Amino acid sequence: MKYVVVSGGVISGIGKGVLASSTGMLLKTLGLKVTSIKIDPYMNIDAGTMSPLEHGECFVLDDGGETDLDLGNYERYLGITLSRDHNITTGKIYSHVISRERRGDYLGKTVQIVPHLTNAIQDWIQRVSKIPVDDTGLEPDVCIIELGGTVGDIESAPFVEALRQFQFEVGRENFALIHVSLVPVIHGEQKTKPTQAAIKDLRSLGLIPDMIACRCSEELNRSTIDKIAMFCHVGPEQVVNVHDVNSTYHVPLLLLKQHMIDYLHSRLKLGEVPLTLEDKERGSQLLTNWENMTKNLDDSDDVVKIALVGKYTNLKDSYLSVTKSLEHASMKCRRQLEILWVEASNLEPETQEVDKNKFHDSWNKLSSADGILVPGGFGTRGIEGMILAAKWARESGVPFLGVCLGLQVAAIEFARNVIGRPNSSSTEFLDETLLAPEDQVVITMRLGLRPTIFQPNSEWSNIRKLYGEVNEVHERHRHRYEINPKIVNDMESRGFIFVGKDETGQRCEIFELKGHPYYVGTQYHPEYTSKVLEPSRPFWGLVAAASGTLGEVIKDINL
Amino acid sequence: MKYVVVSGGVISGIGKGVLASSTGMLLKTLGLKVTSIKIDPYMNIDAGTMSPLEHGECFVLDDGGETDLDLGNYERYLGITLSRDHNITTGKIYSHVISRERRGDYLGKTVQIVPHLTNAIQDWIQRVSKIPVDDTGLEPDVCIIELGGTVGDIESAPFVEALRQFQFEVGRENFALIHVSLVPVIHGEQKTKPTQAAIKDLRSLGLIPDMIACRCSEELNRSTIDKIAMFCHVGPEQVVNVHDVNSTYHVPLLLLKQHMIDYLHSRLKLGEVPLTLEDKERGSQLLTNWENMTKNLDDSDDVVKIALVGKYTNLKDSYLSVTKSLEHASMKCRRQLEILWVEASNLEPETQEVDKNKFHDSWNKLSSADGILVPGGFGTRGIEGMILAAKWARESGVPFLGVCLGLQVAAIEFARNVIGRPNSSSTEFLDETLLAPEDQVVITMRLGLRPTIFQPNSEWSNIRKLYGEVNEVHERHRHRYEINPKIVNDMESRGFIFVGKDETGQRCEIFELKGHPYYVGTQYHPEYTSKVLEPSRPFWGLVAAASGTLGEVIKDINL
Amino acid sequence: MKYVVVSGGVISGIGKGVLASSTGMLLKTLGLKVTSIKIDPYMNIDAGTMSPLEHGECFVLDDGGETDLDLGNYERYLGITLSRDHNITTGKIYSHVISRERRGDYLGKTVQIVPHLTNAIQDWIQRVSKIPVDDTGLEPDVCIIELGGTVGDIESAPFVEALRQFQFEVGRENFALIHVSLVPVIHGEQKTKPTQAAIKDLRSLGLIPDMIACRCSEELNRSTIDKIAMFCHVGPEQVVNVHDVNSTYHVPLLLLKQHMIDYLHSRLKLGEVPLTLEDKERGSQLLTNWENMTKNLDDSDDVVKIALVGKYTNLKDSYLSVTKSLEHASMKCRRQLEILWVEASNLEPETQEVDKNKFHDSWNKLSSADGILVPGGFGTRGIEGMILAAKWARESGVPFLGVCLGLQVAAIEFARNVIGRPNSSSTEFLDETLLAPEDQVVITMRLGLRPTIFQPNSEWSNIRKLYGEVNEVHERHRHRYEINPKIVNDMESRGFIFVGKDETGQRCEIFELKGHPYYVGTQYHPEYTSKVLEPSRPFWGLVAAASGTLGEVIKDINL
Ligand SMILES: Nc1ncnc2c1ncn2[C@@H]1O[C@H](COP(=O)(O)OP(=O)(O)OP(=O)(O)O)[C@@H](O)[C@H]1O
Ligand SMILES: Nc1ncnc2c1ncn2[C@@H]1O[C@H](COP(=O)(O)OP(=O)(O)OP(=O)(O)O)[C@@H](O)[C@H]1O
Ligand SMILES: Nc1ncnc2c1ncn2[C@@H]1O[C@H](COP(=O)(O)OP(=O)(O)OP(=O)(O)O)[C@@H](O)[C@H]1O
Ligand SMILES: O=c1ccn([C@@H]2O[C@H](COP(=O)(O)OP(=O)(O)OP(=O)(O)O)[C@@H](O)[C@H]2O)c(=O)[nH]1
Ligand SMILES: O=c1ccn([C@@H]2O[C@H](COP(=O)(O)OP(=O)(O)OP(=O)(O)O)[C@@H](O)[C@H]2O)c(=O)[nH]1
Ligand SMILES: O=c1ccn([C@@H]2O[C@H](COP(=O)(O)OP(=O)(O)OP(=O)(O)O)[C@@H](O)[C@H]2O)c(=O)[nH]1
Ligand SMILES: [Mg+2]
Ligand SMILES: [Mg+2]
Ligand SMILES: [Mg+2]
Ligand SMILES: [Mg+2]
Ligand SMILES: [Mg+2]
Ligand SMILES: [Mg+2]
C-alpha cells in the first residue's frame, strides 16, 4: 500500500479535502485503485449529533455512518464507497484502546499514548486501507490520508506521532506528505511567513513535507515560490500553486499541469505498482471524461436558476452535497447553475413586520426560480416558510423536489390545500395537544443504504422514468419521522401518488404529483449517491424540468 | 478551596508522592483539612489489571478502587480515606467526555480537548476536592493535586492545559505550583541544567513554579541554589533541598525547617482560612506526634529481622504498603526493622540445580528471621517456595503472618503436613485434573472495605486480643480465590481455628494456629488500613512477636 | 517609566508600526510624554546599506542614523526626535556584548545569551527610554517598544527572553503587551486559528498579551471576538478590531472609540503619572487637532494629481515618507491627493521598442499631472527617465520639486537644455571617460541635520517665502554626490538661482528657477522633517502650486 498524507496549514477550511480528492482522482487517472481515510481529531465519535454551523453538512454512508463532508468529497471524486471505519476520530481511537485495556489485551503493561494509542492508529490505517472501496472489489493501491484540523493543535498531537512513526513502519517509497498552507496577500505582497511557521511546526513534530500546496488569491510569483523553496527545505518542483479557481472541477487540472502527478509518480515509485491494460484504459478514460465535463462547464454558460429553500442558507457548506448534486445535474444538462439561497424563515409573514427588505428579496428570489428545491433540514424553525415555498411551486407549476423534510412539507402542504384538511400538521413541528390530523409521525434513527421498491402502476411517473425500467432504487436514509401510513391512500385520491416504498409497503419513500410537470419528493437523501459524471436521478429530473429539457433527458436515460 | 499542585521533573520515581504527602502533612499541622488528588496520565482506567514491575503495588480503597500507590501515601500521611474519584486518569477522563458526547450533553457543538476535555478535568478537580475525606466529615480546606509523570509528555498535555486554565479559574491566592526536579551530581559538580530545562518546559506550557523542590544525593551548595534562582525566575526562599534522607518520615522535617510551610502560608494566604482552637490543637498535636516518632526511629536502633517471602522482591515498591506497615509496627515497638527480601522461587529445590548461591543465601536469610511474612501475591510462580517458608516457620516456632496468598499457602501447608492430605492443593496453582483435595477455590473479584466478624469462642487467640474487645474488624479485600468452606471444620480439629469470617459464616477471613506463639493469617490486606501513628494490628502482632514483646504490646492495647 | 510592547503576529507588514504609532499618539492625548523604541531582530547594524525591496525606504535621523521607516512613523505621529539608539538590532546588541567581553567587563565569567545578552537588551531599553525626545526636554512617561518581525522566529528569540524578563524587572503596572494578529477571511468565514497559534507561541515564550489587536478586511463579528476571548485567555474588552481603514489617520480614532485607551489607562495606572494642567491641555489640543484634520481629509474630497517619477514605484513603501509628506501638504490645502506612480524607466524611448502600453500609460500619467515630484533615488537605472520628466515639467510650466537625485537631474536637464551644454552629465551615472562637463560630482556619506543658509538676494524666491522670514533652514541629508561648485555661477545666469547653501558657500542645497511658477529642488530630504499638522515646506509649496493656491498658502505662512 502507498500512502499520501494531506495535512495541516495555519487554518482549516482551506482545501485539504478538495486537494486530497483531486490528488486521489489524478492517481486514479493512472489506473491506480485509490482509497481514502479522514482523520478528524475531535472527541465526537461521529458527526451524527453535531449541528451544521461547525464543519457543514453531515454525510451518510451505505452502512449508515454519519460523517464529515470530506468522506462525501472522496466518494464523489474517487468514485468509491466508504465505511464508518474510513473516518478515524479522537473519540473513536481513545474509545478503542480504553475498551482494549478494560478487556485486558495489553497484558498488564501501562497503556500509554506512545506506544499503545499510536500503534492503534497505525493498525487502524493498515486495516482500513486494505478494505475494497471500488466496485472492482480488489484491494487498494494508494490510500489518501487526510489529517483534519491544524498540525500543532493539542488534538492532532497523537495522530502526528502516529503518522511520523508510520512513515518508518512503511518505507519512504510508500509514504509521501503534502502540506496545504495559506499564502495571504497583503497590499499586493504575497507573504511566505505563515507557511514558514507551518513547515517549522511540521519539522518540530518530526515530519518533512514532500509537497507544499499553497492556497492563494492569485498565482504565486516566482519570487514567492523561490522564497518558499529557500525557507522550507524543498525544491521548486515541490511547490504547487492552487489559486482560487472558479470551480473545484478545475483544481485537478491545475495540479496535473503543474506536474504534481509526475512528482508523486517518481516519489512513490508508482510505475512499480502492477497495473493491467484495463486499469490504464479506465484511468485514461477518466481523464478524458473529466476534461470533457470541465470544458462543458467552462463553455456552456446559459443560465438555470434553482431556488433552494431552507435553514442556514448563509453557510453554503451546510448544503455541500445538495450544491454538488445540483451542479452534477446542471453540468449533465450543459447549463450554468445559479442557486438562489432562500432563508425559509424570511418568506414567513412574521418577518415582514420586522423587515420589509429580507421578506421581499427572499420572495423575489423564490419568484425568480426556474425550479425549487426543499432539501433535508436540521430543525423546526422555518417549517411554515418551507410550506409556503412548497405551495407556491405547486400553485405556479414551477418544478419542485422535496428531499426528506422536503417530502414531509410537500405532503403537509397538499393535505392543507388540496385534500382539504385545513389544520393538518407534523409531530416534529408541534405537540402542544394530541392532534388527530397528524401527517408526519415517528416509526432512534433510520440510516444507511435501503431498498425502495416502485409500486406496480407507477410507470406514468417521470421520477420512475428518470431511474428507467428498474423496480428497485437503492438510496441512503436519515430520518426518524416520516408520513402517516393511514393517510396515504386518501392523499393518492387527489393525485399525490406514492410512486415508491419500503418492501413492506408500510414506509413511503418516493412520490410524484400527477397534476404538475415535476412535483416530486424522496424520503432518502439522493445527494449522497450523486457522482460527477452521473448525477442523482431526482436532481437530474429537477434541473432538466427547470431547463424545459425533461423529455430530452428522460429520452437519453431510457435509450 | 486552596490547591497545591505538585508536578513534573526530568524523571518519574523521584519524590512527587513523598513531597506531596509531606506537604499535605505539614499543612495538616496548621489544623487545615487536607485532601489529595492523583492525576495518572495513562490510558488505564485504574491500576487493577496492571502488573507490579511498572509503578509498584496496587493500592485498594474502601470503595474497592484499585489505584496508584500514591493514594496509599496520601491515606497514611494525611490520615484520610479516598474514593476511586481521587485518582484521575487519561482513560477515565476521555471515557467521561466520550460518554457525555454520546449522551448529547454538548448540545451539537464540536467536542474538543480545549475547551471540553480541559473543562471536564477542572470540573472533576472541583467536584472531588469538596468530598469529605477526614473522619470529621467537613469539606477540605486544601487539595494537594499530584500530576504524575513528566511535564511535556504527550500524555500529560491535556492535564497541563487544564491546570494552567485552573490557575485562573481559581484566584492566584488559591493555586500554588511546586515543581520537583533532579539535581544530578557528576564528578562533585551539582548540575543545574536538567532543572533549567524542566522550568523552561513548565513556562512553555504556560505554568510558573511557586516552589522548586530539588532532589539531590547531598545538600545543595549555595552556588547551586543561587544558580537555580538565576536561571529559573524564583527567589532563593522558593528553592527547597530534599537530600536523600535515611527515612521518608524525616522528609516533612526538612521541608518544615527550610521554611516551605512559611512560604506556602503566605503564598496561599492560609491565615485567612477559618480555623477553630480544636483544629489548631489537633494540628499542633500531629506535629508533636511526628517529631516523637521520628526521634524514636532515629534513637531506638536495636534490630528485628522480618523475612518477607514472595515474587519480585528485588523491586521493593512491589511491596510498599507491606514495607510501610512493617515500619509502623516496628516504630511502635521502638525497634530497627530489617526486611530480609527472600525471592520465594530461590527456596525451591529446582533453584539449587541451577545455582547453589541464590538457594543458600535465600534459605540462610529465611533462617535468619526473627519473624516471617508471606504477603499477598501476583501469580502462581513461587507457590511451593512460599509453602516451604510457611512450613519452616510452623516447624521452627518463628512468628508468621500470612496475608491473602499467605493465608492460602498457610492452609495448604497445614493440610499437607498436619491434617495429613499429602497431595492437597490450589485451584489457582493447578487445574491439570479435577482434583478432589482442593483447599483453595473460587467464589470477578472481591474488593473494598468488608466486615469480618470474630467467631464466639475465638477470645483465646492473640490476633483477636491485638484488635481488643471488638466483635467486628473492617478491612480491605482483593481476592477471587479463598479457602474451601467444606474443609475448614476438619482443619479446625488440628488447631487451625478460623478466628474470623464474613457475617454469612461461608467466607473465612482470620485464622490463628493454637500450637504456635504467633502463626496467623488474614484474607484481607491489613497493610492498606495502616497509619503512621497506629499500625495495622496483624503487622503489630507479627513485629511484637518477633521482638519477644507480644504480651507487653497486647497489654498496651487492652488497657 | 511605563512600557507598552507592540508585538508579533503570523506575518510582518500588518500594522505593528501604525498601531504602535497610533497607541503612542493616543497616550499623548492624555498629556503623557511618549517615547518609542524599535527592535529590528536582524544582523544589519543599521538600514544604511540595505536596498528598498525589503522593508521599504531608509529613514534618516537628526544624528544621521539610517533606520527602519518605523522610526519615521514614530517621529511624525508622536512628534518626537529619535537617535540611532532608539533602534535596537541583533547586529547592534551582539556587537555591543562582544565588544564588552573583549574589553574584559564580564569579569572572567562565561558570557551567554541569558543572562548577559538579555541583560544588555534590558539595559539598552532602560537607558534609551529615559532620553528626552520631545522639545520640552523632560524625561518620557511611556515608552512604546515595537518588536519587529514575528514572535517565535529564531532571530527574535533573545529579544522575547529579554522582554519576558523585563516584564518582572519593571512591575506589572509598568509593562503591558499588545499582540497584533491577522484574522483572514476565507469564504466569508473569519478564521480565529492563526491568532490562536500566535497567542500559544507567545505563551510558549513566557509572555501573555494584555491586548489583542486583530487586523482584518472587515469588522470582526461578535462570534469572532468571543471565540478569540475563549481560545486566547483574555476578556472581550481586550480585543480590538482594526479593519483596513481608508487612511492611517483614522486608525487612532478606531482604537479610541473601541476603549483601548480606557483599558491601557487602567492597566498601566496612568492616572498615577504626575501631569500638569499644561500637559493635559496640550494633550486635549492634540486630540481636537487630529479630529479636525481627519474630518478635513474625509470631507474635502476635491482632487490634486501629483506625478511621482522614480525607481520601484510599484512598491509604495519604497517612498513612505514622500507619500506621507505629500498627504500632509494635501490635507493642509484641503485637497484629495492622488499620486501618479510613474516608473521613470517606462518614459525612456527604449521602453517603447519593448512595449507601447507601459510607455504610453506612464507618459499619459505624467501628462495628467497637476504637479511633479522627482524624489531621492537608490541608483542609476532610470536617470534619463527622470531627466525627461524634469524637462517636461520645465517646458510645460507644471510645478516641480526635485529632492536629492531630483535636484541633481534638474540641474543636469537645465545644463543640457537651457545653459547649452549638449552632453553634460553625472559622475554617478557615467565614468566611461574623464568627461569635462560634469554637473554632478563627489565631495563616505553626508548624513543628519545640517544648516542650509539662504543667500542674501534670494527673497524673490517662492521657496524662501514658504519658509518665511528665516535665514537658516535645518534639514536632513543623505548624499555622497552633489552639484559641481565651479558650474553654479554660470547656471545662475539663466535664472537657476541656488537660493540656499551650506554656511561655507561651497555646497548648494536649495534652488529655484526664476522663469517658472514653481520649479525647485533641495539637496536635503524634506520628507524626514514633515509632521501631520505641519507639512514640510517644499512639499507644501509643491501641492499648493499644483492646486493653483500657492499665493494663498504663502500668505497664511507669512501672516
Ligand atoms: N482552490 C479552490 N477554489 C475554490 N473553492 C475551493 C478551492 N479549494 C477548496 N475549495 C472549496 O472550499 C471548501 C472548503 O475547503 P475544504 O473543506 O477542503 O477545507 P479544509 O481545510 O479541508 O477544512 P474543513 O473540512 O474544515 O472545511 C471546499 O468544500 C471546496 O468547496
Ligand atoms: N528524599 C527521599 N529519601 C528517601 N526516599 C525517598 C525520598 N523521596 C522519595 N523517596 C522514596 O522514593 C520512592 C519513589 O518516589 P515517588 O513514588 O514519590 O516518585 P515519583 O516521582 O513520584 O513517581 P512513581 O510513582 O512513578 O514512583 C517513594 O515511594 C519513597 O519511598
Ligand atoms: N488598518 C490599516 N489600514 C490601512 N493601512 C494600514 C493599516 N495598518 C497599517 N497600514 C499601512 O500598512 C503599512 C504596513 O504596515 P506596518 O509597517 O505597520 O507593518 P509591520 O507589521 O509593522 O511591518 P513592516 O515594517 O515590515 O512593514 C504601514 O506602513 C501603513 O501605511
Ligand atoms: O519589523 C520587522 C520585520 C522584519 N524584520 C526582519 O526581516 C526578516 C525578513 O522576514 P519577514 O518577517 O520580513 O518575512 P519573510 O522574508 O519571511 O517574507 P514574507 O513571508 O513576509 O513574505 C525578519 O525575519 C527579520 O529579520 C525585522 O527585523 N523587523
Ligand atoms: O561544551 C560546552 C559547555 C558549555 N558551554 C557554554 O557554557 C554555558 C554554561 O551552561 P552549562 O551548560 O555549562 O551549565 P550551567 O551553567 O547551566 O550549569 P550546570 O547546570 O551545568 O551546573 C552553556 O550554556 C554554554 O554557553 C559551551 O559553550 N560548551
Ligand atoms: O478537518 C478538520 C477541521 C476541524 N476539526 C476539529 O474542529 C476543531 C475546530 O477548530 P478549527 O480548526 O475548525 O477552528 P476554530 O474553531 O479554532 O475556528 P477558526 O479559527 O477556524 O475560525 C479543530 O480544532 C478540530 O477538533 C477536525 O477535526 N478536522
Ligand atoms: Mg476536509
Ligand atoms: Mg471552526
Ligand atoms: Mg507518585
Ligand atoms: Mg517506567
Ligand atoms: Mg514596523
Ligand atoms: Mg519579507
Numbering used by the authors:
A (entry chain B), B (entry chain D), C (entry chain A): 1 to 443, 456 to 571
Q: What's the paper's own text on this?
A:
CTP synthase (CTPS) catalyzes the final, rate-limiting step of de novo CTP biosynthesis (Lieberman, 1956). Each CTPS monomer consists of a glutaminase domain and an amido-ligase domain connected by an alpha helical linker. Glutamine hydrolysis in the glutaminase domain produces ammonia which is transferred through a channel into the amido-ligase domain, where it is ligated to UTP to form CTP in an ATP-dependent process. Budding yeast have two CTPS isoforms, Ura7 and Ura8, which share 78 % identical residues.
